[PDB]
């Protein structure tokens, strides 16, 4: 008897997979405990239309992030600070870069996503990955400068 697993069960199959088991197993264990649903043709489309819709929201992330990988990687965030020789008196944070990428260049950005543990305490030209979506990591060139 074909069923659609609602959960991944050991040596049975992965959630949402169509497996074949014995009638009594499905009727007196799986279906009563919510572990699987009858692989009827009706909800076999319900499975299909989730496989379909979930792939749609995901490829929309990988093609909205791509447009955000075009704006960045094709510009530079110049950041003016007060600096002595090379060490900065303050510090430039990811929050600073975000609030900097706001007013300048127009793009608002999520600070918590940027890859930067400690605040930048020296001048220079940095390459900071953004990661708005895995496998789509945006390399941002940010130039810390003085005055």
């Amino acid at each position: 008897m074909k069923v659609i697993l609602l959960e991944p069960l050991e040596n049975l199959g992965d959630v949402g997979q169509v497996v074949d088991v014995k009638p009594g197993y499905a009727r007196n264990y799986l279906l009563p405990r919510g572990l699987a649903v009858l692989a009827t043709e009706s909800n076999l489309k319900a499975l299909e239309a989730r496989i379909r819709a979930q792939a749609k929201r995901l490829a929309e992330r990988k093609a909205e992030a791509e447009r955000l990988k075009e704006i960045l990687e094709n510009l530079t965030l110049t950041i003016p600070v007060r600096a002595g020789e090379t060490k900065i008196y303050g510090s430039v944070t990811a929050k600073d870069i975000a609030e900097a990428l706001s007013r300048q260049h127009g793009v608002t950005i999520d600070p918590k996503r940027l890859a930067l543990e400690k605040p930048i305490k020296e001048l220079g030209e940095y390459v900071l990955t953004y990661k708005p979506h895995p496998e789509v990591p945006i390399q941002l060139k940010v130039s810390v400068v003085a005055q």
Binding site: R27, L31, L38, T40, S42
Partner: protein, 97 residues
């Protein structure tokens, strides 16, 4: 030993035909009937308990039509069944037949 609530399968009357002899096809003289008496053949009636709208509903159903019960439950997902009694849920289930 009664009526399938899904199919309407009913106890039917059958003859029990006792035969002796070698069949003509086996090269024998032929089959002889040493007795014919009525008997009943029953549906393979079984209990199927399922939960619908929180309540527990029992069907008396021939084995042949056991999946037809679970279908009626799926078809009952789109019904305003909440708060009804089991006797009322059953009537709604069978109405969908």
């Amino acid at each position: 030993s009664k009526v399938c609530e899904i199919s309407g399968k009913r106890p039917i009357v059958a003859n029990s035909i006792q035969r002796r002899g070698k069949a003509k096809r086996e090269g024998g003289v032929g089959k002889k009937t040493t007795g014919i008496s009525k008997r009943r053949q029953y549906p393979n009636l079984q209990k199927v308990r399922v939960r619908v709208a929180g309540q527990e509903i029992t069907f008396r159903v021939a084995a042949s039509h056991i999946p037809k019960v679970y279908e009626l439950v799926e078809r009952a997902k789109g019904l305003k069944l909440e708060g009804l009694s089991p006797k009322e849920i059953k009537k709604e289930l069978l109405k969908l037949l």
